[PDB]
Every structure is written in structure tokens, then in C-alpha cells.
Design a protein around this ligand. Structure first.
Ligand SMILES: *[C@H]1[C@H](N)[C@H](CO)[C@@H](O)[C@H](O)[C@@H]1O
Ligand SMILES: [Br-]
Ligand SMILES: [Br-]
Ligand SMILES: [Br-]
Ligand SMILES: [Br-]
Ligand SMILES: [Br-]
Ligand SMILES: [Br-]
Ligand SMILES: [Cl-]
Ligand SMILES: [Cl-]
Ligand SMILES: [Cl-]
Ligand SMILES: [Cl-]
Ligand SMILES: [Cl-]
Ligand SMILES: [Cl-]
Ligand code: NA
Ligand code: NA
Length: 837
């Protein structure tokens, strides 16, 4: 960083051409073939209506990129010059001034190339030829004798498995097929003296409250022929002030040098996850000094913490949980997918907003699921500074893969590159070999699809990749981080004997058609996947569809559904709990309410059942395009009802009323580090007009210990509420400390929404609108159920939404958007259940 090197970004002056046309046009780099075409209206909007079919032709053509740049005489006399490609998608021939520098074959590898002997004083010409990844792999497929069973690869021929390229680019059961190419990450040229730091690893040797012991491991590449005396320095600082400083004398030899400097931090300030404290980061800087001058420098942000994954046999089967700084931590978060069909269109602002969405929803963990990418350095920096643990899959999902020597050598290159790239992040907690490949080999009926000899080949192939190569590479390069070969590693949703062993993917809800209530009984040791779909709200549907298409199974809505079951299954689930509205608009509103309430029920069952269950990661956080899917946040950044419900279900203190077998239990759930003493629970039945039925019920002298779920109240329904009252009232619950200050509250309904006697009502609101802001006060004299405050403004944020407005209780809501202007009244439309029939 702060050294005598000069860096030139090659981010301007690029042109592209469809190969064999000789027509050139301006391009943006980093970027994609598809975005470059869109920018010159050579493709329609890939996301609108039926346009998916209309853009498939791009994957059959080859594509060429070129730029030129100036090098001075002074630059050419530096000791060394490197050209760095952080990403090429995928089969790319790189030519500089007549030299073939590189034949790239892995989207997930960065390439560092020496170019000083090939550079010229004046103009320099860089050309890149991108072979179609389809045409490049058709002969490979022809030679194979069988088709890999990759059902998410939306083509007769399943060519995805032969290419180290983002699996979802070929299609997915929530995804558009956009098999793109190009310079997907930045290109840089570094001019320097003596040497570069190829790698800086801060290895934590031990950590106690009294001391942290580190080993600073440096790989230094020396480009000059002489022996060079040098001083290696490491500076450890906190908030700009030096904590400790160490140095070592060396003489650097030509080529690779290994340097190790120990360092200690007495009374260390620990990194803590979101909800448990501050995600404190130290600045570790390494310098190579030759005389006056600092020839190379590299820094990392470093969090001092311990992370142990506990996976041991016990009385219930096999445990699966995270211990952070010595304390077992119930996991709360979601599975993350790519934010766009076109990865470089995802901006810094969009990454910062997604981490804001996770932190505000009380999350402490994200799984980077194995059909996407190894994410960019910014994703992992934001995880570090927001206290969110990362579960990292390798990029293999839902099919067996090849295991021939050439293919395994490509995989080894990506594994070593991305382990060294990511191993200094505080957030990084564990590596996972793949998503569901063992499950697929055991249970998806491959015995019947292939010969005995091919099935046998697939099974031996699984072990070579997932039980040998990947675990050895983690042992060698990240030896204190946990690795598991697959998620889920043994449990099957169809086999209850197996649920006590490791993590679960519960396909029972959605694919199995089970009701949401099944989640109270079908418990795992750790839920790493479960979910339910929704249509996104109307302002997103209008981005891909017209009013002619507003039907659950129109041609266009079916084109924005990629699951087998499809859109009618949502109708099937809705009927069990809600009256089905006639309006499409009203159906969509109720679908959002449905997904939120059903999933929140599962999240609550998982926390309630700790310590048998030690975490829950729902499917899925986010969307790559305008689509019907399992997401809690649509493509445009709009929170669905699920996201507000995840935030509530993940609250550090939670009152959880649960009704089973005509009785009510109330559990108090805490992920706090401190115990709470002398607490009062208070409850009160209130009818849909605001009249108390009976007296208040009070439970005193309650203890809520750190990191526990405990029952503190049970009562039969017969003898308390009339069946008529269960249709016409709700329970208010509140938790207060010794002094009577409120620390939590909850609302309970005794019957399904469709069996409620909801009074017709209207929600009135006053509005005060300034620049960037609108403050609403809401009022109804009768209960309004599950209200949705709807506005046309894309990405508008709400203090709250998708909540019950209680009878004669005024409610303040704040709406923020940089697009909100004083004197330009924001349109507001307030929906509620009773209005839909
Ligand atoms: C789980 C997800 N629910 C889908 C199938 O139900 C599919 O994306 C994949 O199997 C995921 O792991
Ligand atoms: Br060089
Ligand atoms: Br180099
Ligand atoms: Br050495
Ligand atoms: Br990047
Ligand atoms: Br293993
Ligand atoms: Br019941
Ligand atoms: Cl020196
Ligand atoms: Cl937490
Ligand atoms: Cl076969
Ligand atoms: Cl219909
Ligand atoms: Cl309820
Ligand atoms: Cl009404
Ligand atoms: Na990079
Ligand atoms: Na919990």
C-alpha cells in the first residue's frame, strides 16, 4: 500500500467485438458481454416478460476485448512490472505486444504475470479472446459417453460440470440462464523496486484474556539478481495508535523468500459477533525496508477471537454448533446467493445495504452457498466490521462432478488461491465441500439412470474431490478452521431416524407439502436450509410484467417461476390458512403475509428447542433478478414480510407463545451474555374493539438466564376462552424488569386467520414529508390484521411494516429514501386482511 510502487488501473479505453464481424464498440471493464450489448441496445432487457429465450444466442458466439496504454521511459526502468487479472470468465487467451501471456481456464483464480521484458516505451496493446464456454466444452461432452445429472443446468447438454465457472450462470430453480463472459474483476499494472509481498498471513497461535500470540508469515518475491540487505517490520495498531512493533534483519535472495516474525498483544480486545459486543479490528501492516525506502507494504484488518465448530457423538446422535470466544452461540441468519445475473453490475452501495439488511434483522451468520462465487474482498470486509460469521461452501452444488487429473489440478489452483485470499478475515468460520452432492448420490435415484460401472465411477470420484483434495488443502493452508465434506453430511428430510445426526436441509416444507406446524415436531441439531416461496410486491412485478399477465399461472408468471411445484403450490398453502382473494394484487399481498408467518413459526421452533437445536439459516436471503422465490428481500432491495418477521424472531430477547393440543405454553428465549432477574410476564385478552376480557394475568419472580429457552407458563384453553372468544380476541404479552421497564412484547391469535371474525375497518393516517423522509401516524379503532404500507418508490426503507395495528393504539412509522422530496406527496396505500374479501 504505502510503499514506492506505482499502480495504473486499466479500467478505461476498452472495446469489444463479436468474433468474425470486425465491428468494434466501446465497453465497460470490469463488466460482461451481456451488459456491453445492452448498453448499445443489441439485447432487450433480459429480465422483462418472455425475453429469456431472446438472449440465449450470446452463449454460442466468441468475444474479443482490446485496450491500449502508455508506458514512460522512467516506468520501464523500474526493477519489476506485474499485470494482475483478479478474474477472467472463463476460457481467455491474453495477448500483450505479440506475446501469449496466459491461457485462462478458471473464473475463480487471480493471475499475477511478469511483463517488464514484453512492455514497450509508448503505446502498448492488450487483446483478450474469450472462447464460448459452450463451444469449448461440446467436444468434451461428446467424449464423455453420458450426461451428468445437473437438473439446474437449463439445457439438453449439462456442460456446467466441465467448467470452473459460477454454476447458477447456466440456470437455477430461482435463476435466469445468462451464460456470460468477460473481465469480471479489476485489471492492474504495478511498477516497483526490489520485491513484492506475494502473501501476508497473520496466524493466531493462542488467545487468552491475558495474551494473544501471533506469527506474521510473509512470502516475498525478489525480482533483481543481487543479494539485497533489508529490514522486515510489522506494526500492530488500534484506531491509529501503535500497540506493538517488531523487526528482523534479512538479506533477500533472488526468487521466493519465507520470513516469519512473532508478535504478542497483552490484554487483547476480542472480536465479538453481532448481539454479543463490538467487532473490534486491529490494523496489521508489514513493510520491506531497503535503506531509506519502503519497497513493499501489505496490511490486513485482524480480529482476535476463537471459533470452534463442535461436531461430536452425544446422547441425541451428533452435535453441530459454533463456540465463539469459549461460549456456545445459537446461529441466526440465511443462505446468500449472487445479487445479480451480471456480477460486476453489483455496486459497493448494494453490498453495504445487504449487510445493513442482515445486521438490522439481528443476524450473526451467513452461508455463501456453493452454486454462486467465492465473494469479493468487500463482502468479507463488511462481514468483519458487522460481526457476521461466514460459512464458505466451495463452488460445487447438486450434481456429481468429474474427478480426472486435469480437472482436479484446476480445482487445487482455485482452492489454494481462495483459501489464501480469505484466511485473514475475522468473519470466516468454516469451509464446506459442496451443497447436497452426497444426498444426491445416495437418494435421488442415480442407481437407475446410469450403468453400474458409471455409478461406481461417480462414487470413487466424490471421495477423490471432497474427502481427499479439498480437506488436505484446508489442513495445509487453514489448519485451525473446520472443514465438512457436504451440507447436509448425513441427515435426510425423508428419514426421521437421521434428524439427530449433524445439520438438516428440511425439504418437508415446500417440496414435501408439509404444513408449517410440522416444524414444531420435525427438529434438527442445526437447520442449514429450509424455506417457502412468495411473489414479490406489485412494484417489482410491474418491472417484468403487464396487467394482461396478472394471473398465478399466466405464461409470464410461469416464466418467472423456476421450481417444479410452481405458483399453484402457493395457492394450495394459502387456502389452508387464509381466504383466497379474487384480485391478483390482493393475492400477492396475502402471499407475502403467508411466507412471513409460516417461516417465523419455524425460526421460533428452532430457537425454542435449544440446546437440542443450535442454529437456523433459512433459504434464502436475496434474489439475482425479478422472480418468484424463497427470498426475504426482492431483487430491488425491498423487504418482504419475511424479513420483518426474521428480525422479530431473532430478537436477543423473545416471548414465544406456542399453542398445541388446545393448550398455550409461553417460553422466554435469550441470546444475551447476562442473566435477567426478578422479571414479570404480564398477559391480557383484548377483543377486536379494544375491550379487556377478564383481568390481567401476572407471573412474577421470573429468571431469564443467559443463552437459554425456558417454559414459564401453561394453561388449557377449555375453561378460559369460549370458542366464540377465540375467533374475536387476541393475547397481548409483555416482559418487564424489577422496576417495571418493558424489555419485550408479543401478540397471539388463537385460530387461523381465515377463521377470525375480522370487523370491516379503514386505517386513517396523518403524513409529515420532508427531504429524504416521510413520518406516518396510523389509527384504526378496530384491529387491522397484518397491514402492508405500500408505496411506488423502489428500495424505500420502513422503521416497520407487515404488523397488526391494534384497536385504538396510534402507531408511528418512518419511511426513508434519498428520492423523497419536500412538497411531492409520496403515494401511500394501506392494505389489511379484512379488505381482501
Ligand atoms: C435447496 C432449495 N430449497 C432448492 C430445492 O428445494 C434448491 O435450490 C437446492 O436443492 C437448495 O440446496
Ligand atoms: Br518483471
Ligand atoms: Br510476477
Ligand atoms: Br527463504
Ligand atoms: Br472485486
Ligand atoms: Br472429510
Ligand atoms: Br390448538
Ligand atoms: Cl536495510
Ligand atoms: Cl448472537
Ligand atoms: Cl451410463
Ligand atoms: Cl385463475
Ligand atoms: Cl399467532
Ligand atoms: Cl374492510
Ligand atoms: Na480480488
Ligand atoms: Na436462541
Amino acid at each position: 500500500g504505502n510503499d514506492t510502487s506505482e499502480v495504473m488501473l486499466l479500467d478505461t479505453g476498452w472495446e469489444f467485438s463479436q468474433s468474425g464481424t470486425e465491428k468494434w464498440m466501446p465497453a465497460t471493464v470490469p463488466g460482461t458481454v451481456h451488459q456491453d450489448l445492452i448498453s448499445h441496445e443489441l439485447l432487450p432487457n433480459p429480465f422483462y416478460g418472455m425475453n429469456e429465450k431472446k438472449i440465449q444466442w450470446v452463449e454460442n458466439e466468441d468475444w474479443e476485448y482490446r485496450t491500449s496504454f502508455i508506458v514512460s521511459e522512467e516506468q520501464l526502468n523500474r526493477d519489476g512490472i506485474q499485470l494482475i487479472f483478479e478474474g477472467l470468465d472463463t476460457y481467455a487467451d491474453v495477448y500483450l505486444n505479440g506475446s501469449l501471456l496466459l491461457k485462462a481456464d478458471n473464473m475463480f483464480v487471480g493471475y499475477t504475470l511478469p511483463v517488464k521484458s514484453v512492455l514497450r516505451k509508448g503505446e502498448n496493446h492488450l487483446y483478450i479472446y474469450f472462447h464460448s464456454p459452450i463451444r469449448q466444452t461440446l467436444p468434451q461432452y461428446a467424449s464423455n459417453g453420458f450426461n451428468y445429472p445437473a437438473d439446474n443446468d437449463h439445457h439438453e447438454k449439462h456442460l456446467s460440470v466441465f467448467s470452473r465457472k459460477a454454476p447458477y450462470s447456466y440456470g437455477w430453480d430461482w435463476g435466469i440462464r445468462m451464460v456470460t463472459s468477460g473481465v469480471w474483476r479489476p485489471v492492474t499494472l504495478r511498477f516497483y523496486d526490489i520485491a513484492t509481498i506475494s502473501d501476508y498471513y497473520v496466524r493466531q497461535l493462542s488467545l487468552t484474556d491475558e495474551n494473544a500470540r501471533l506469527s506474521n508469515e510473509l512470502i516475498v518475491n525478489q525480482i533483481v539478481p543481487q543479494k539485497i540487505p533489508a529490514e522486515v517490520r510489522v506494526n500492530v495498531s488500534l484506531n491509529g495508535t501503535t500497540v506493538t512493533e517488531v523487526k528482523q534483519q534479512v538479506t533477500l535472495q533472488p526468487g521466493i523468500n519465507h520470513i516469519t516474525l512473532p508478535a504478542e498483544v497483552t490484554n487483547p480486545v476480542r472480536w465479538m459477533p453481532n448481539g454479543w459486543g463490538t467487532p473490534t479490528l486491529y490494523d496489521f501492516s508489514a513493510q520491506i525496508a531497503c535503506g531509506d525506502r519502503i519497497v513493499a507494504e501489505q496490511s490486513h484488518r485482524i480480529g482476535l477471537r476463537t471459533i470452534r465448530v463442535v461436531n461430536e457423538k452425544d446422547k441425541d446422535g451428533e452435535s453441530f454448533y459454533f463456540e465463539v470466544n469459549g461460549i456456545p452461540m445459537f446461529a441466526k441468519g440465511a443462505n446468500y446467493i449472487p445479487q445479480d445475473a451480471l456480477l460486476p453490475n453489483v455496486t459497493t452501495e448494494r453490498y453495504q445495504t445487504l449487510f445493513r439488511d442482515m445486521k438490522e434483522a439481528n443476524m450473526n451468520m451467513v452461508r455463501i452457498w456453493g452454486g454462486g462465487t467465492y465473494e469479493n474482498n468487500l463482502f468479507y470486509d463488511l462481514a468483519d466490521e458487522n460481526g457476521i460469521l461466514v460459512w464458505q461452501d466451495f463452488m460445487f452444488a447438486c450434481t456429481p462432478y468429474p474427478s480426472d487429473p486435469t480437472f482436479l489440478k484446476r480445482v487445487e489452483a482455485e482452492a489454494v488461491y481462495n483459501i489464501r485470499r480469505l484466511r485473514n478475515h475475522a468473519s470466516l468460520a468454516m469451509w464446506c465441500g459442496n451443497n447436497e452432492i452426497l444426498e444426491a448420490l445416495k437418494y435421488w435415484g442415480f442407481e437407475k439412470k446410469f450403468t453400474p460401472e458409471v455409478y461406481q465411477g461417480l462414487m470413487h470420484g466424490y471421495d477423490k474431490l471432497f474427502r481427499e483434495l479439498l480437506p488436505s488443502t484446508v489442513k495445509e493452508f487453514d489448519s485451525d478452521r473446520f472443514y465438512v465434506h457436504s451440507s447436509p453430511y448425513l441427515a435426510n428430510w425423508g428419514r426421521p431416524e437421521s434428524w439427530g445426526t449433524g445439520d438438516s436441509h428440511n425439504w418437508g416444507v415446500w417440496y414435501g407439502k408439509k404444513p408449517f406446524e410440522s416444524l414444531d415436531t420435525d427438529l434438527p441439531r442445526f437447520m442449514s436450509e429450509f424455506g417457502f416461496q412468495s411473489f414479490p410486491e406489485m412494484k417489482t412485478i410491474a418491472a417484468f410484467a403487464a396487467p394482461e399477465d396478472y394471473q398465478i399461472e399466466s405464461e409470464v408468471m410461469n416464466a418467472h417461476q423456476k421450481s417444479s411445484i410452481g405458483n399453484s403450490l402457493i395457492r394450495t398453502y394459502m387456502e389452508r390458512d387464509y381466504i383466497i382473494p379474487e384480485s391478483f394484487e390482493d393475492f400477492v399481498y396475502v402471499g407475502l403475509v403467508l411466507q412471513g408467518q409460516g417461516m417465523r413459526h419455524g425460526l421460533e421452533a428452532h430457537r425454542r428447542n435449544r440446546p437440542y437445536c443450535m442454529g437456523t439459516l433459512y433459504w434464502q436471503l436475496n434474489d439475482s433478478w425479478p422472480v418468484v422465490s424463497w427470498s426475504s428481500i426482492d431483487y430491488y432491495g425491498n423487504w418482504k414480510a419475511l424479513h420483518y418477521q426474521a428480525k422479530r424472531a431473532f430478537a436477543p430477547v423473545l416471548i414465544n407463545p406456542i399453542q398445541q393440543n388446545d393448550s398455550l405454553s409461553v417460553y422466554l428465549i435469550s441470546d444475551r451474555l447476562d442473566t435477567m432477574e426478578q422479571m414479570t410476564l404480564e398477559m391480557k385478552v383484548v377483543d377486536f374493539d379494544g375491550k379487556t376480557l377478564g383481568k390481567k394475568i401476572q407471573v412474577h419472580s421470573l429468571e431469564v438466564p443467559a443463552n437459554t429457552s425456558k417454559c414459564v407458563y401453561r394453561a388449557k384453553l377449555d375453561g378460559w376462552l369460549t370458542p366464540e372468544d377465540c375467533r374475536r380476541s387476541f393475547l397481548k404479552l409483555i416482559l418487564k424488569d424489577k422496576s417495571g421497564h418493558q424489555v419485550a412484547e408479543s401478540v397471539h391469535f388463537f385460530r387461523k386467520t381465515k377463521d377470525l371474525q375480522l370487523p370491516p375497518t379503514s386505517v386513517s393516517y396523518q403524513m409529515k414529508q420532508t427531504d429524504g423522509k416521510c413520518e406516518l401516524t396510523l389509527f384504526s379503532s378496530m384491529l387491522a390484521k397484518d397491514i402492508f404500507i405500500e408505496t411506488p418508490l423502489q428500495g424505500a426503507r420502513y422503521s416497520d411494516n407487515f404488523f397488526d395495528l391494534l384497536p385504538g393504539e396510534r402507531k408511528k412509522v418512518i419511511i426513508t429514501s434519498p428520492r423523497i422530496k419536500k412538497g411531492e406527496e409520496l403515494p401511500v396505500n394501506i392494505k389489511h386482511i379484512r379488505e381482501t374479501y
